[PDB]
Design a protein around this ligand. Structure first.
Ligand SMILES: Nc1ncnc2c1ncn2[C@@H]1O[C@H](COP(=O)(O)OP(=O)(O)OP(=O)(O)O)[C@@H](O)[C@H]1O
Ligand SMILES: Nc1ncnc2c1ncn2[C@@H]1O[C@H](COP(=O)(O)OP(=O)(O)OP(=O)(O)O)[C@@H](O)[C@H]1O
Ligand SMILES: Nc1ncnc2c1ncn2[C@@H]1O[C@H](COP(=O)(O)OP(=O)(O)OP(=O)(O)O)[C@@H](O)[C@H]1O
Ligand SMILES: [K+]
Ligand SMILES: [K+]
Ligand SMILES: [K+]
Ligand SMILES: [Mg+2]
Ligand SMILES: [Mg+2]
Ligand SMILES: [Mg+2]
Lengths: 524, 524, 524
């Protein structure tokens, strides 16, 4: 199609316009007194949110060049959310500041590539300064403080997050879902629990709750399909001689074997329950091996050279507790040597280190948690569905910030650490005066977050920034309290990863935008 | 459909308009201080690029006559990128200069074919002068310098390119892909490696990394399908008697044979690993023959008159190392006579010389590299995706320029070589005064590259061109440094192939355009 | 649909408008200083061409009356290109002149049918005069001159055409294709060659070249599909006893026979190569009979009453050389009596004389060339694709003109012969003063070509035409040289067929167009 071509100042003005529109839409949610943004939904009611990336992702402009600017600036928020899950609004504000300063530097007729070089140098120095200024976030108090800061000053969310990591541990998995009541709740599960119920309600040994209870039972891990009873007469006789319950974790059990087992349960011969093997395919085999390791048994598969008829008591795993219900089976305290369990979790961690997809990494981490860690479920409770969405978004932001703080430490929140970095980097000079101008662009830029946080609170961004600059260390301005003091002491902790990634992505997008001279787009 | 027909001056003005629009869009990226262009993408965010052909290929004009002008001038950039992969912006600038001068000459009422003849004569003489002025580029310093020049003054890209060429060698293959971190990395593989993993995780002899290790093993190259164990009882017994590991590179292994082999591995009988034969079809047979030559074995195929049951230890290839993982198998230091390997690579090179498609040539060169050379992979690391694209484009341009410089030598960069050629070709005269006008058209034209390079730097193209003309040899104007000096000294090297091809394509397009008088296009 | 109807002068003005538009578009490429035209291509790049029929075929007008006038005048160029392949622009100019003069006469009360009668009489007399003035073009110098004239003053094209005709001969076939380099090349093939490679790479006795070489081999021509080896046990044993190589030109060879033959090759028993029979269907049978005649063998078919098992050494053709590669097999110096070969080519020539389709005629001529003549391939080399197209069009025009000159002789080029004819026909009178007006119309008309050729050179068409008329014989005006002299001596030779056909078609279209009084067309 025929193309519209822009050169020089027109394209730069269009980028500035799109960036300014997107940043103005996003930044109103920054800081403790940032307000909410409601996004129209064609299919359903409009959604109320405070997350900056959510607001940024819904921005599109009729003007094609300004649309280009909005798209290129949205990458900062997108990548900031992708990396740490927090500071997306701070990332957008930083990007807008860098874009503004660099464009007005370009307007002087001066070389844009040298501006990009200076901005990159200054931002690398800023990342180093932030890493040096990072202080570890390991205590539950600091975790709760980080969660509160990221959840828009919500102590309950940070407290629940710290409790989840404390109960579950570092190697466990913590997830957030919607609740049924008006309050949040936390559930912790240890051991292996897989979403596989009993294959027959007649296996239920307690009609009051409809559950199957197995005390110190054998576990037959069949990596195969059980179709005929004849394949498992030997193991059934072995179980009957042993007299202990049996749990058959198989791919599935057909009608004949299921009928025989349910008959034998109420005939008093063998107390046998049958459940399906969790997972599908290679993940099913991996989970079966995990169950074998934790229960000290051998998975029954034809691919290794053994048959179900040849299986004996040794090939049967053992566990202290087997809980079964309509949906889930939990194997609690299986007899498993810690050597095999730790070897298996080491193999899973090695696979994690060679896992690129986040889904595979999460599944492997959940497998480790079932083997060694735990599973936490946090249900969000409130009255309405918009409150569902907003509170869940705040909880997820708090969880991301808490994890980032745990893994990388904390720094003074509210843009105070960035002001300290700017003070420490006022001496940086590049290859020429042009890279010096780029460095000064970055230095003027990273003071934007505190200024915008204060602006959302209705106070003076300039006076606050000047007073914070006159201070040192963690001295700064609590925007929720509107008072000058130490950010670390009064709980204003920002993850170092969040700020560092936000600044890096903002700089990377803005420096390349600086060198723009021309656009080719479609005709309106 | 009804056709719009133009004649004479209006049509030539339309061609000049389209050429000027396309050249103005392209030339902003020329020179070390050239700026880059952001191109809007309908599917995704706009892409920031500095490659001239990339900007040229996105140009389309609403006016059908100017659209034809843009299309006909785009051929210069397209062919320049196709030939050497660099100098596309220089090609576009040269084409625009030749078009402008030739159309101006036509505006005087003089025969256009005489301009075409004079331009062709002058450009042929210029190609001869560039070939004579070409100095070889074999040292790694010159290669790194060429890469830096083509990568928009990036020393790291040229250094990595020189390192890859040195480690891998001349007959190897070097490729560039995107990385995962923020920095570029280089990986070199010597020997033979094919993307085939083990057919069973039970073949893994090291659960820590999930890999199969075979030390001094036999190699059974089956150019067939292995279905029954009975076909390989003789070779299995021979391997067991030998006691050395075995690697079966076959088309595929079914369930029965795979189960038997995995059983025998953990039963201690034979340490056997099975992988699929790389390639599909005739290329699979060629790769199997390559493996046979490198490992000194015989490929097992029914088309030659021998059977798998009749195969013995002699038909089994041997190698010092066999590495297998989930995806790849490397045969390291196979026992292969250099006579057979060199004959095979000679046959592959003969096929290359009779290979028209670039894909077939690349595959054959990769086969030679596996047999004799190596494989280099350069991962581009940076914060954002637009930086992915821009840095990878710069790296690819640098790689193309370095290869062109290695194969054809270097000349003084920044358009100095063309100015020297113009000084040496000021005496050329054609069949008539009109062909002399065409020669002067070409002579005025090839001074355009330095002028545009300096213009992108904000200095005086005319003063710079005059000062360079007053100089001699490689004396010129470093546009990045903005200083006069010998371009060879500070590393401003341009491949002779790049400039020669660019000038040839520009002249060939422009000379044929000049003789145009009439236009037939569709009605708007 | 409702029809728009025109009568009398308005319809004739519409005819003249369409004719004039098409002729003005076409005639800009006439003569040595004719221009080039760029035609817009919706699917691909616009094409630069100088061929008159190519420009004519792309002309369409919005006005339906002028559009149908353009359609009827396009028939002159179309038929001129169909007949001789050259002089299409001359045909268009002649048609425009005849149309203009006839319409001018009609406007004065002329009887249009009498104009048609007089024009036909004068043009028939002109054709007779051109035939009488034709001088044979048999020397390679005249052929090269004709090619140069038709290739827009390109000596190389005419020289290559003459060389191809000399090497290949009169009964051979010469074709023009695009090359890979920057220069034209000529390849001549004698004997017979068919595009069939070896059926197995194991047949290759020369792996360095990947070719099957057979010295004094038997030739088994199987007009059948061979499936089982048992069919060639007799002839395989006969060949083994003979000990000479064997080439099986069959419809195809299946897996069992191919495997047995490839086994027997490397076993040193029989040197057997297998290739597919060229052609499909009746043409395959004819080509197999051609191979039998040239190699002195018998084609093995079931339709005659003999079987492959009953075939002996006598049924096997013999030859001196058999060349096979991945694609082609050539039989060089087959032992074939000239009686059978000449009888076969006589039958093919008889089929040619009864062949209406040009494709069948070309295939039969190629069969004769394989049996008796040769095959020439001329590759066009140049930098760009538009130059591919333009140079190939010039080469094809030169080839057509050279063939027409060889078959019918030459006359003075540049419209000089037409002026001589007009001078010789100034005395022709028809049935009445009306047919005299028609004759004068034609006489005024055929002086147009030289006038337009000179007009394309920027000189005076009237002064040039007057000076040429004042001359005699081949005295005329070299428009490329702009000098008066003999056309024949300086190499401006025009094929008599080209000019005669052009004039005939122009007269036939124009005389009928003159007799029109009413138009019926669609409503806009
Ligand atoms: N009491 C406070 N005093 C000063 N600054 C504060 C205070 N509470 C929060 N902040 C700052 O305000 C910001 C928190 O705003 P908010 O959580 O809405 O957005 P964000 O951290 O930029 O990212 P996201 O859009 O992903 O939620 C951080 O920069 C934080 O340091
Ligand atoms: N320091 C320098 N001083 C002078 N000229 C330079 C310098 N560095 C590069 N050049 C010139 O500038 C040009 C390099 O620009 P650039 O690499 O962007 O485009 P290109 O070589 O025309 O091709 P492409 O569009 O394929 O990248 C070359 O003509 C080179 O000779
Ligand atoms: N040097 C010359 N001096 C005079 N007339 C010439 C000269 N060279 C060519 N001509 C004339 O010019 C014409 C050749 O032009 P051109 O080959 O472009 O078109 P054409 O022969 O009419 O047909 P086509 O359109 O098929 O190419 C012929 O009439 C030829 O006699
Ligand atoms: K926010
Ligand atoms: K460029
Ligand atoms: K022509
Ligand atoms: Mg936040
Ligand atoms: Mg370049
Ligand atoms: Mg012609």
């Amino acid at each position: 199609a025929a193309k519209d071509v822009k050169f020089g100042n027109d394209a730069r003005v269009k980028m500035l316009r799109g960036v300014n529109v997107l940043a103005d839409a996003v930044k109103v949610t920054l800081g403790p007194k940032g307000r909410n943004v409601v996004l129209d939904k064609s299919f359903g009611a409009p959604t109320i949110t405070k997350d900056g990336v959510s607001v940024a992702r819904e921005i599109e402009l009729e003007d094609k060049f300004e649309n280009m600017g909005a798209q290129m600036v949205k990458e900062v928020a997108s990548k900031a959310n992708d990396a740490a899950g927090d500071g997306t609004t701070t990332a957008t504000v930083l990007a807008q500041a860098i874009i503004t300063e660099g464009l007005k530097a370009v307007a002087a007729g001066m070389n844009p590539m040298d501006l990009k070089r200076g901005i990159d140098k200054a931002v690398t120095a800023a990342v180093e300064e932030l890493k040096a200024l990072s202080v570890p976030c390991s205590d539950s108090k600091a975790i709760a403080q980080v969660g509160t800061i990221s959840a828009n000053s919500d102590e309950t969310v940070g407290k629940l997050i710290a409790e989840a990591m404390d109960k579950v541990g570092k190697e466990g998995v913590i997830t957030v879902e919607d609740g049924t009541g008006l309050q949040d709740e936390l559930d912790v599960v240890e051991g292996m629990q897989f979403d596989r119920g009993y294959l027959s309600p007649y296996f239920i040994n307690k009609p009051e709750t409809g559950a199957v209870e197995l005390e110190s039972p054998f576990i037959l891990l069949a990596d195969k399909k059980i179709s005929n009873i004849r394949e498992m007469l030997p193991v059934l006789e072995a179980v009957a001689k042993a007299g202990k319950p049996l749990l058959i974790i198989a791919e599935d059990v057909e009608g004949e074997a299921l009928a025989t087992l349910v008959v034998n349960t109420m005939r008093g011969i063998v107390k046998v329950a049958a459940v399906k093997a969790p997972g599908f395919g290679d993940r099913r085999k991996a989970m079966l091996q995990d169950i074998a390791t934790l229960t000290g048994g051998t998975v029954i598969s034809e691919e290794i050279g053994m048959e179900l008829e040849k299986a004996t008591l040794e090939d049967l795993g053992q566990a202290k507790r087997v809980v079964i219900n309509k949906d889930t089976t939990t194997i609690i305290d299986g007899v498993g040597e810690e050597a095999a369990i730790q070897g298996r979790v080491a193999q899973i961690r090695q696979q994690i280190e060679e896992a690129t997809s986040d889904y595979d990494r999460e599944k492997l981490q959940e497998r480790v948690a079932k083997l060694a860690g735990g599973v936490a479920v946090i249900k969000v409770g409130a009255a309405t569905e918009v409150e569902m969405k907003e509170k869940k978004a705040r909880v997820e932001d708090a969880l991301h910030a808490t994890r980032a703080a745990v893994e990388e430490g904390v720094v003074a929140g509210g843009g105070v650490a960035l002001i300290r970095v700017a003070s420490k980097l006022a001496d940086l000079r590049g290859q020429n005066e042009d890279q010096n101008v780029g460095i000064k662009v970055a230095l003027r830029a990273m003071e934007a977050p505190l200024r915008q946080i204060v602006l959302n609170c209705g106070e003076e961004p300039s006076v606050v920034a000047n007073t914070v600059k006159g201070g040192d260390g963690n001295y700064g301005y609590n925007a929720a309290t509107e008072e000058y003091g130490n950010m670390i002491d009064m709980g204003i902790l920002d993850p170092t990863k969040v700020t560092r990634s936000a600044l890096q992505y903002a700089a990377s997008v803005a420096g390349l935008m600086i060198t723009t001279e021309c656009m080719v787009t479609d005709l309106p």
